[PDB]
Amino acid sequence: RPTFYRQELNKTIWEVPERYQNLSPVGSGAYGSVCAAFDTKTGHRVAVKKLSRPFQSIIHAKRTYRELRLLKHMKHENVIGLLDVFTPARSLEEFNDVYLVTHLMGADLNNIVKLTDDHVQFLIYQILRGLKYIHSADIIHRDLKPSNLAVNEDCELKILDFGLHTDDEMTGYVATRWYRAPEIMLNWMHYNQTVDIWSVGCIMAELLTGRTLFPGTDHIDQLKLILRLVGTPGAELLKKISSESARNYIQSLAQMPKMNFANVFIGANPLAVDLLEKMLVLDSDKRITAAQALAHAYFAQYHDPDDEPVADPYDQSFESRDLLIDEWKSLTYDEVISFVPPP
Numbered sequence: 001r002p003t004f005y006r007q008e009l010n011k012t013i014w015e016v017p018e019r020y021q022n023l024s025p026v027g028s029g030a031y032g033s034v035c036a037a038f039d040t041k042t043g044h045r046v047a048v049k050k051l052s053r054p055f056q057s058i059i060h061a062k063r064t065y066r067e068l069r070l071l072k073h074m075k076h077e078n079v080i081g082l083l084d085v086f087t088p089a090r091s092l093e094e095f096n097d098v099y100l101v102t103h104l105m106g107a108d109l110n111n112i113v114k115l116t117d118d119h120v121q122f123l124i125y126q127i128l129r130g131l132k133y134i135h136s137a138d139i140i141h142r143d144l145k146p147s148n149l150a151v152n153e154d155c156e157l158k159i160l161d162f163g164l165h166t167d168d169e170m171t172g173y174v175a176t177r178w179y180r181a182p183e184i185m186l187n188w189m190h191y192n193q194t195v196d197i198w199s200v201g202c203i204m205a206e207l208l209t210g211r212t213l214f215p216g217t218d219h220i221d222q223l224k225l226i227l228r229l230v231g232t233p234g235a236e237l238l239k240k241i242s243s244e245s246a247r248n249y250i251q252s253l254a255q256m257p258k259m260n261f262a263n264v265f266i267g268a269n270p271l272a273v274d275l276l277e278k279m280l281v282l283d284s285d286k287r288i289t290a291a292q293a294l295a296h297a298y299f300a301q302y303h304d305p306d307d308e309p310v311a312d313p314y315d316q317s318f319e320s321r322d323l324l325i326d327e328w329k330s331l332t333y334d335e336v337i338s339f340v341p342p343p
């Protein structure tokens with residue numbers, strides 16, 4: 001057990017191992033209770049997150065367990081990883097607080113982009129390499145957007161802030177909805193991992209143009225912008241929409257054909273236009289997969305099929321389990337004390 005020390009940072013007690021020095025808050029509350037520190041063991045600048053109210057409800061205790069399980073699994077260059085997890089508690093009986101540690105990441109895709117074709121090739125390659133890994137473990141991100149992509153001075157990228165979202169959060173003229181696949185925005189059907197590829201298309205279009213692709217003022221305005229570009233649905237997709245009311249609403253709209261993407265993305269690399277056509281497909285069954293997109297000619301400069309790794313299998317059977325607060329808290333304690341740090 002390391003030696004812990006205490007200090008108060010912006011109205012908050014922090015009790016952390018001596019290896020972590022120079023704790024200074026970051027985000028102005030945007031990231032939660034998150035400090036920058038220097039890690040004397042590894043020499044890395046790190047981010048330390050102190051969870052708020054981790055066991056306050058069944059919902060909150062399960063969410064804490066879910067976050068720790070996902071962060072302990074993800075071991076990939078293009079995905080957030082866990083450098084450490086700790087508690088000052090010496091037993092289950094006195095366990096209350098959880099702290100998570102990762103690489104300090106001060107800039108997101110907006111900070112760098114709010115870009116040449118080469119920059120777009122490399123940034124989208126890295127998102128797709130990370131997603132091939134995530135999808136191979138049957139994990140769905142569900143919230144890819146520029147603020148959830150960390151980028152450094154060498155244009156190296158990591159995916160963070162996995163979907164673990166409020167009705168009010170998704171209402172009106174908001175970036176929280178602009179990157180969402182239509183089938184999840186309007187609850188058309190059971191969604192799967194293809195929702196993430198729609199988001200990658202939206203991000204790639206905005207890196208090429210400098211403009212949000214579907215900046216809707218509300219859910220309905222946003223669906224009109226999407227159908228103007230990709231076309232109204234055919235009979236085959238309408239059959240897959242499980243809500244009769246959602247089906248009836250779509251059939252009230254005047255039919256529109258798919259637009260010519262070379263006349264929308266004027267001057268772009270033809271290979272970029274072709275890849276956008278394969279991502280931004282309304283029927284999720286017909287979208288290009290991450291593994292297929294890595295092999296597209298647009299990424300010929302970067303693609304190496306011997307350096308695009310898959311994940312170990314990920315058991316999420318807990319998601320269907322009904323437990324008490326103290327059962328979720330005990331499972332979380334076991335995962336803190338069993339953590340093994342990376343080499």
Ligand SMILES: N#CCC(=O)N1CCC(Cc2ccccc2)CC1
Pocket residue numbers: 026027031034036047048049071080100101102103104105106107
């Ligand atoms: N500067 C700044 C921001 C910053 O460094 N990042 C964004 C906030 C997350 C918070 C976090 C910490 C540990 C485990 C999961 C998530 C990570 C780091």
Ligand SMILES: [Cl-]
Pocket residue numbers: 002003017018019020
């Ligand atoms: Cl220490």
Ligand SMILES: [Cl-]
Pocket residue numbers: 079080081082102103158
């Ligand atoms: Cl990381």
Ligand SMILES: [Cl-]
Pocket residue numbers: 087088089094095096097098
């Ligand atoms: Cl504690």
Ligand SMILES: [Cl-]
Pocket residue numbers: 145146147148175
């Ligand atoms: Cl964003």
Ligand SMILES: [Cl-]
Pocket residue numbers: 313314315316
């Ligand atoms: Cl597992």
